[PDB]
Design a protein around this ligand. Structure first.
Ligand SMILES: NC(=O)C1=CN([C@@H]2O[C@H](COP(=O)(O)OP(=O)(O)OC[C@H]3O[C@@H](n4cnc5c(N)ncnc54)[C@H](OP(=O)(O)O)[C@@H]3O)[C@@H](O)[C@H]2O)C=CC1
Ligand code: SF4
Ligand code: SF4
Ligand SMILES: [Zn+2]
Lengths: 126, 373, 176, 114, 290, 111, 94, 48, 208, 95
């Protein structure tokens, strides 16, 4: 009711109990995941995935597994806008990198363009 | 001392001041682990978050996914699910009786009804193969239907078990000193029964005529003849009586379910949710593709949140799903009758003594696995 | 539809109240309880002599996690990783290479018998029934190293009995 | 941007509440080190307590400082009861080195640590 | 060298470090703390024994999943010892019973045992072998114990000379010999100086020596950081104990002679901090009364 | 009537006029509230419906048939609860227009 | 069974419930294992020529929930009032 | 295999002395059964 | 759709629609959304200042009894200025209907302790405080349940990882149980599983 | 049936034999490395190539619906005998 409020940023790493080593050490990455190109389906777009950097993964000497001393290794954070993505990355204290979304460029194709008269565009095989 | 929980009881001499359960000694991370799996992967968490009920929680989660997914299970699978749900209610009530018996003393009917429970574990073994953690209930019907030579064994068990519960009522139940142990302990106001959120056998045992099977029949329970007992007084001798009568009504429901078994079908006829049978898998192409992607990715679910609850023998077993439109759940929570019953221990133990407090904890069907979520 | 209980009053007729008084001051139903317990005393016990008489089981019990091989042929496994894809504890570990013959095969096939919750999804998910839940129950191993089965452990394990597993599968290939 | 407070009006009442909390922690140590049959002198534990207070020293929002006061209040209630045990109080100390320094040469002999 | 012997990532609890340590004895007290610090480091430890598997069982879960391994040896044959040091990066000799038995006196344990194991370890080709002994083990009189240790040190220097002869002072810990010896009493008043040194910094120095180079060949000693009076020590443990196989060889070992040596480095010269009596002594002096 | 099924709820003997004066207090405490709020309209509607059921009837079992909420005393308790929220809803001004809307990218679920 | 009639009469006199009749130890009442092999039906599918999955599409019928609100016989309840229960016939108390 | 006893006392095994050389006159174990008799004695079937 | 399809009760659809429109019209101060699911359970989406007034209304008012309290949950959703969702669930004894009161909240600004109107909400509030951090002012007891007291971090966030930062073991050096940083012996192999190709065209959110 | 290391150890069907600078050898000390005695590659070449004088054939592999699913393989190349990807056993046409 028009109360106390100050206008400042947020530093939630004092609250969430995380080690400051894993705060100042690592660095987030915010990106739209590129389409797995062997498939052709663009539903895997329309997100904003936040990952962390990959780190040390040695081998289990007894079996031949993959062991790591990395607690923040296998997270991913699905967001829906870059604005609140960068806002959250600022808000929870860690540093971050911002890649940029690259759309499929629209084109101009026709079967009639494939079957021209003098133009060298000619499929010659179908 | 075995019961496993922490209890801090500050008291004036042998009576009371304030007793508080520190629970959280058992916390595992079930909700986070279901948040990192698929549905079909994370079904056994629902099998064992309550671990005594081994088919009721299966039934609850499968009805949660069917309710979110809008697929009716086939009728023969519904009757089989009803039969195993009532067997499981029988087993959980008879465990609660015998564990209160051994927690108070009363060494032998523990062993007697555990012989009966070994017979029912034999039935679970022949049906699924597990001893106790029989998953067996996919979303969308019953997987791998029951073999030949089972129903007459259920029939023989039903006759023998009616005689054995009569002999248990011969042993205890008008037993003088057990009644003298339990007369007027655990008073519950109906307003306290509502505001403290007690559910199931507490509400059955004190006041309100409230049963989920007869108020929202979630399956073919509307076709079987039975009656839930209502409790008269806020005490646990009466609540014991309503447990034993719910056992006998479960026997009636098992007899009618044996008499009303249709020879319909095993699973749903939806090969995008239930996996196809193995012969038509290894012949057909579409069946192989549906098997393969159904076990890798899992079935997609339309988004949204739902809540449902059924009768666990402890009470309103609620499962609350949050499903982003995906192959994974996004969140799940378990509204736990054990947690709700543990919530009101100050009102159930304000005016008694500590041995009677142990009797209060014992006479409510607690497991402290379901109290954890 | 309900049946509420504790509807009797203590009857003020002299017969019922003197019967309850004689019940109180003569200790009657306690002796009735002793009679019921003696009735279970003179029965015959349901105790199987365990190391000789082994208990009854089912044709669909889930035990050993064995592998199988073809009749007069090599491993039934293909290494298509469906069992690691469905394994809810993620106990299966598969690393696959083909041999020089061209057929696809493995290198490494690990089961964490610690992590193994014994569902049966790997039995009911393999398209060829390569890995099969065994019949037995005896693992009972002293060292934590030795409950981590490798592929050759499973091959020497499933080749310890075939006709058992094949008999169970021939009994049980129609209900599933 | 009218945002609700928790308890205070600026950082000044927050300083008052945290110095009350520090006074309670300072006179709350010797009963704990007497009760739990510990292993460490009083002044060393008090120095690590005031070091923990020094650790969060760059927080300016009133809600966050109030919430840290609430966290310290909850932990102080639990330590002044005997709900916690020897393991937790030793878990506040960090004696299980891990002596891993910020020396870039020592960061180089055991590495891959940006 | 073959791979999976280099350190891997971070350190500790299957964060794989470098060494493979074959340890003799190790059912004993200092050996148990050394196995505990190697399990904290996470290296692979090979310990043979001769006792019941109960004792190695209670020191077992300190090791990680399969990181320690238990095998067998006898006090005579070189064969099982060579089998124990077939594949061994580093090896340590921590052996010794502090009295004579009917089958093993002071002879041929300190005489025969480091000779045989140093022989088969030189034949196997180990590096950074470390043999423990006691400080002030000299050829001179009144100590069969210490003169057998000095013979053993001359053995270690003579055969397999590329070793590390090491010696602490009277070390104390949770299962000390002499602190329990001073508690299990009922007693003579003479003049003696003595320095005790706390156990965990000693074994951290041991593992620092075995994983660091430049320390081969040199003999090392460990020094109590105050070097105070025997009578003050007995009165101090008396006042803090709050109560206002003992052969003659043991009582002469604890009363007779203790002295410093300036030839050889102590604690901080190797690069480890030494911590005095007081704090850990208040820790270990429980068991006052009821 | 005679030893009802609820535990901590003991029966009365003259339910009628007690419930009558309870409903008149409902109408009056509602009467202190402004008229244009349709909350007053719906509460006044349902309470005059219920009081017209009761005031026309000196029956007991037929009163439990015609008016829901069995048996009898729970109706009294429910009207007591309604009177409690009436006393609380003199305050809190719930018929005022909307408090500040969310930023509207929030109840959009499938994210 | 396999007991004499004397201790049998003692068991029946200790509790009169026809102890020889239902003895909780079955002998050959168990249905025989290794049964004749089963044949299993297919339900309301697998009959061809009509069954488009476009028709019987139980998955795709989920709709987004309908949204409202960012001379009146009204103030209705969420449901009709529930029919109050009944004393059952099969031996209530009383 | 006897029939006049109840369900469970059907099938019982009696071992031998040093079937491998372990003095198994005493201290008998499970997994000392050949596989077809392991399907037999666990009451999974009705055929010897 | 005559076999194998779960039928739905359009009677209940219309009844819950009329009741939700009733509640939304009679409390305009706090009601923001009333939505009916296709499987017919009512959802009421609520500003976090009418917690106590709307719960006093819903427990009482006798046109909607709703004594039974089910869960209170908090679901952690990023990409929102107000992250968390306090989800009350109410069940009516006399009526057999279920409403989901979804009131929203942020990280820091509290809500106001439903234990003053609902005794069952006590330990639910204590649990949701311990696991998330939605502060509950005017509440008697906010302690830690379902964690260790030496543990902290509110682990049911999406920001907190799967495996925690600490890990217990025993050591004979300090003769006790110690808590080291996490050292996994196996990876927890995470599976990218979400295929493309738009499994539900009805739920297509619009593009930018 | 097997081969043997220069150190004198049972090798596997997979070529994973050891150095003299290892430690998995020292965890093999005293405890038997239980290799599979019977290999897998060896049994295939002992099999007679089943010859059917058809063109395109079917395969099941030891019982209907007990084994790998039906695979229809081609026999139109002559010097390249068609191998089932599941069975492994070859086929030849006849004319
Ligand atoms: N005052 C002291 O205690 C000090 C001792 N030391 C040195 O440390 C060692 C003593 O350490 P501590 O742990 O306290 O005592 P221990 O006697 O327990 O350590 C010796 C270990 O080696 C074993 N062992 C010794 N001799 C034989 C043998 N002949 N055959 C088989 N096993 C044998 C012992 O018994 P088992 O065979 O049952 O395993 C034991 O496990 C000695 O070598 C001593 O020189 C150094 C400084 C101070
Ligand atoms: S066992 Fe079966 S499911 Fe697993 S990889 Fe092999 S063939 Fe595939
Ligand atoms: S039974 Fe379950 S946990 Fe075990 S290996 Fe198979 S799928 Fe994995
Ligand atoms: Zn084939």
């Amino acid at each position: 009711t028009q109360l106390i409020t100050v206008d400042e940023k947020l530093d939630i790493t004092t609250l969430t109990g995380v080690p400051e080593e894993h705060i100042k050490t690592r660095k987030a990455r915010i990106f739209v995941p590129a389409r797995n190109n062997m498939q052709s389906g663009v539903n895997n777009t329309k997100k904003w995935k936040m990952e962390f950097d990959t780190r040390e993964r040695w081998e289990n000497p007894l079996m031949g597994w993959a062991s790591t001393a990395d607690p923040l290794s296998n997270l991913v954070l699905t967001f829906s806008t870059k604005e609140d993505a960068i806002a959250f990355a600022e808000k929870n204290g860690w540093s971050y990198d911002v890649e940029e979304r690259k759309v499929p460029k629209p084109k101009s194709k026709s079967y009639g363009a494939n079957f021209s008269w003098n133009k060298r565009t000619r499929v010659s095989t179908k | 001392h075995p019961a496993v929980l922490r209890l801090v009881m500050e008291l004036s001499g042998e009576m009371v001041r304030k007793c508080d359960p520190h629970i959280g000694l058992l916390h595992r991370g079930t909700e986070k682990l279901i948040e990192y799996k698929t549905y079909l992967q994370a079904l056994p968490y629902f099998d064992r978050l309550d671990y005594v009920s081994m088919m009721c929680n299966e039934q609850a989660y499968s009805l949660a996914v069917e309710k979110l997914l809008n697929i009716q299970p086939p009728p023969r699978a519904q009757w089989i699910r009803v039969l195993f749900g009532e067997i499981t209610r029988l087993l959980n009530h008879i465990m609660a009786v015998t564990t209160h018996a051994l927690d108070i003393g009363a060494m032998t009917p523990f062993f007697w009804m555990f012989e009966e429970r070994e017979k029912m574990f034999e039935f679970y073994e022949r049906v699924s193969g597990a001893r106790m953690h029989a998953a067996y209930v996919r979303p969308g019907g019953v997987h791998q239907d029951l073999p030949l030579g089972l129903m007459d064994d259920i029939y023989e068990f039903s006759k023998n078990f009616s005689l054995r519960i009569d002999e248990l009522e011969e042993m205890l139940t008008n037993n003088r000193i057990w009644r003298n142990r339990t007369v007027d302990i655990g008073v519950v106001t109906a307003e306290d029964a509502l505001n403290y959120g007690f559910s199931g056998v507490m509400l059955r045992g004190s006041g309100i005529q409230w049963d989920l099977r007869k108020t929202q029949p979630y399956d073919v329970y509307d076709q079987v003849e039975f009656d839930v007992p209502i409790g008269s007084r806020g005490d646990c001798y009466d609540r014991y009586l309503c447990r034993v009568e719910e056992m006998r009504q479960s026997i009636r429901i098992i007899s009618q379910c044996l008499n009303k078994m249709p020879p319909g079908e095993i699973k749903v006829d939806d090969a995008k949710v239930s996996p196809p049978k193995r012969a038509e898998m290894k012949t057909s192409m579409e069946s192989l593709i549906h098997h393969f992607k159904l076990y890798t990715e899992g079935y997609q679910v339309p988004p949204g949140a739902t809540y449902t609850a059924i009768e666990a023998p402890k009470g309103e077993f609620g499962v609350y799903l949050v499903s982003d439109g995906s192959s994974r759940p996004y969140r799940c929570k378990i509204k736990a009758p054990g947690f709700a019953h543990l919530a009101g221990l100050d009102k159930m133990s304000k005016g008694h003594m500590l041995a009677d407090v142990v009797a209060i904890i014992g006479t409510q069907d607690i497991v402290f696995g379901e109290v954890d979520r | 539809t309900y049946k509420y209980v504790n509807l009797r009053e203590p009857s003020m007729d002299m017969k019922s109240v003197t019967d309850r008084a004689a019940q109180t001051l003569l200790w009657t139903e306690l002796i009735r309880g002793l009679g019921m317990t003696l009735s279970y005393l003179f029965r015959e016990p349901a105790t199987i002599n365990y190391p000789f008489e082994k208990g009854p089981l089912s044709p669909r019990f889930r035990g050993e996690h064995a592998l199988r091989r073809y009749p007069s042929g090599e491993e039934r496994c293909i290494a298509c990783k469906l069992c690691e894809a469905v394994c809810p504890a993620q106990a299966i570990t598969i690393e696959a290479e083909p041999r020089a013959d061209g057929s696809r095969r493995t290198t490494r096939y690990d089961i964490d018998m610690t992590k193994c919750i014994y569902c049966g999804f790997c039995q009911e998910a393999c398209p060829v029934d390569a890995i099969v839940e065994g019949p037995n129950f005896e693992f009972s191993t002293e060292t934590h190293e030795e409950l981590l089965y490798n592929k050759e452990k499973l091959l020497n394990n499933g080749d310890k009995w075939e006709a058992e597993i094949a008999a169970n599968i021939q009994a049980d290939y129609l209900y599933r | 941007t009218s945002v609700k407070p928790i308890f205070s009006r600026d950082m000044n009442e927050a300083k008052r509440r945290v110095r009350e909390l520090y006074r309670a922690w300072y006179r709350e140590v010797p009963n704990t080190v007497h009760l739990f049959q510990l292993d460490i002198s009083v002044k060393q534990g008090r120095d690590k307590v005031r070091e923990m207070f020094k650790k969060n020293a760059h927080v300016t929002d009133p809600r966050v400082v109030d919430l840290l006061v609430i966290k310290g209040k909850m932990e102080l209630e639990e330590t002044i009861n005997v709900w916690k045990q020897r393991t937790h109080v030793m878990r506040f100390f960090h004696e299980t080195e891990a002596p891993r320094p910020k020396d870039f040469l020592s960061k180089f002999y055991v590495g891959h640590d940006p | 060298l073959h791979h999976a012997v280099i350190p891997h990532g971070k350190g500790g609890r299957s964060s794989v470090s470098g060494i493979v340590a074959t340890v003799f004895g190790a059912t004993g007290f200092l050996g148990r703390y050394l196995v505990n610090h190697l399990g904290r480091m996470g290296s692979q430890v090979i310990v043979p024994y001769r006792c019941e598997p109960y004792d190695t069982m209670h020191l077992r879960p300190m090791g990680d999943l399969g990181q320690i391994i238990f095998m067998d040896w006898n006090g005579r044959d070189k064969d099982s010892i060579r089998r124990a040091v077939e594949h061994s990066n580093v090896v340590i000799n921590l052996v010794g019973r502090e009295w004579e038995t009917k089958n093993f006196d002071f002879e041929d344990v300190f005489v025969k045992i480091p000779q045989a194991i140093a022989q088969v370890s030189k034949e196997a080709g180990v590096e950074k072998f470390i043999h423990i002994s006691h400080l002030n083990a000299d050829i001179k009189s009144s100590s069969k114990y210490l003169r057998n240790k000095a013979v053993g040190e001359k053995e270690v220097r003579e055969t397999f000379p590329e070793a590390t002869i090491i010696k602490p002072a009277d070390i104390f810990g949770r299962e000390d010999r002499f602190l329990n010896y001073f508690a299990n009493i009922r007693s003579l008043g003479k003049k003696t100086v003595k320095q005790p040194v706390y156990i965990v910094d000693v074994t951290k120095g041991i593992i620092n020596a075995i994983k660091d180079p430049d320390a081969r060949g040199k003999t090392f000693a460990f020094v109590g950081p105050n070097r105070y009076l025997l009578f003050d020590l007995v009165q101090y443990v008396f006042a803090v104990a709050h109560r206002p196989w003992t052969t003659r060889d043991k009582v002469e070992r604890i009363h007779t002679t203790d002295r410093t040596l300036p030839h050889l480095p102590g604690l901080e010269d190797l690069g480890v901090q030494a911590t005095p009596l007081e704090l850990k002594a208040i820790e270990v002096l429980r068991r006052h009364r009821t | 009537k005679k030893t009802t099924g609820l535990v901590g709820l003991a029966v009365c003997e003259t339910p009628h006029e007690r419930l009558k004066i309870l409903y008149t207090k409902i109408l009056d405490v509602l009467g202190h509230i402004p008229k244009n709020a349709a909350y007053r309209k719906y509460t006044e509607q349902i309470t005059n419906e219920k009081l017209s059921i009761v005031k026309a009837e000196p029956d007991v079992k037929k009163l439990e048939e015609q008016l829901q909420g069995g048996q009898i005393e729970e109706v009294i308790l429910q009207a007591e609860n309604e009177l409690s929220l009436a006393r609380k809803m003199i305050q809190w001004k719930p018929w005022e227009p909307l408090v500040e809307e969310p930023p509207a990218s929030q109840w959009k679920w499938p994210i | 069974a396999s007991a004499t009639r004397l201790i049998q009469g003692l068991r029946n006199w200790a509790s009169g419930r026809d102890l020889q009749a239902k003895l909780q130890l079955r002998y050959q009442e168990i249905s025989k294992r290794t049964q004749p092999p089963p044949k299993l039906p297919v339900g309301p599918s697998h009959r061809l020529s009509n069954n488009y999955y476009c028709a019987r599409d139980g998955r795709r019928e989920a709709m987004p929930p309908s949204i409202v609100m960012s001379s009146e016989k009204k103030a209705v309840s969420p449901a009709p009032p529930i029919k109050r229960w009944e004393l059952s016939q099969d031996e209530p108390y009383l | 295999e006897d029939n006049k006893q109840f369900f469970g006392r059907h099938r019982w095994v009696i071992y031998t002395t040093e079937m491998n050389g372990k003095n198994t006159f005493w201290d008998v174990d499970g997994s000392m059964v050949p596989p077809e008799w392991h399907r037999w004695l666990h009451c999974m079937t009705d055929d010897p | 759709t005559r076999p194998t399809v779960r039928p739905r009760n359009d009677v209940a659809h219309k009844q819950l629609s009329a009741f939700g429109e009733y509640v939304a019209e009679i409390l305009p101060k706090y009601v923001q959304q009333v939505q009916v699911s296709c499987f017919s359970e009512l959802e009421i989406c609520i500003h976090p200042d009418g917690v106590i007034p709307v719960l006093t209304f819903l427990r009482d008012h006798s046109n909607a009894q709703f004594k039974s309290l089910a869960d209170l949950t908090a679901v952690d959703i990023p990409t929102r200025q107000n992250r968390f969702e306090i989800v009350y669930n109410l069940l009516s004894l006399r009526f057999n209907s279920r409403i989901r009161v979804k009131t929203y909240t942020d990280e820091l600004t509290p809500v106001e302790s439903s234990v003053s109107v609902y005794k069952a909400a006590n330990w639910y509030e204590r649990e949701i405080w311990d696991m998330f951090g939605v502060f509950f002012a005017n509440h008697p007891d906010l302690r830690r349940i379902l964690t260790d007291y030496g543990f902290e971090g509110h682990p049911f966030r999406k920001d907190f990882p799967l495996s925690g930062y600490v890990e217990l073991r025993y050591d004979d050096e300090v003769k006790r149980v110690v808590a080291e940083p996490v050292e996994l012996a196996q990876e927890f192999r995470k599976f990218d599983l979400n295929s493309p190709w738009e499994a539900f065209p009805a739920y297509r959110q619009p593009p930018e | 049936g097997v081969r043997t290391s220069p150190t004198g150890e049972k090798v596997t069907h997979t070529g994973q034999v050891y150095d003299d600078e290892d430690y998995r050898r020292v965890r093999f000390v005293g405890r038997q490395k239980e290799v599979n005695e019977n290999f897998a590659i060896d049994l295939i070449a002992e099999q007679p190539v089943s010859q059917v004088g058809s063109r395109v054939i079917s395969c099941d592999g030891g019982g209907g619906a007990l084994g790998h699913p039906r695979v229809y393989i081609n026999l139109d190349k002559e010097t390249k005998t068609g191998t089932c990807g599941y069975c492994g056993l070859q086929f030849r046409q006849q004319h």
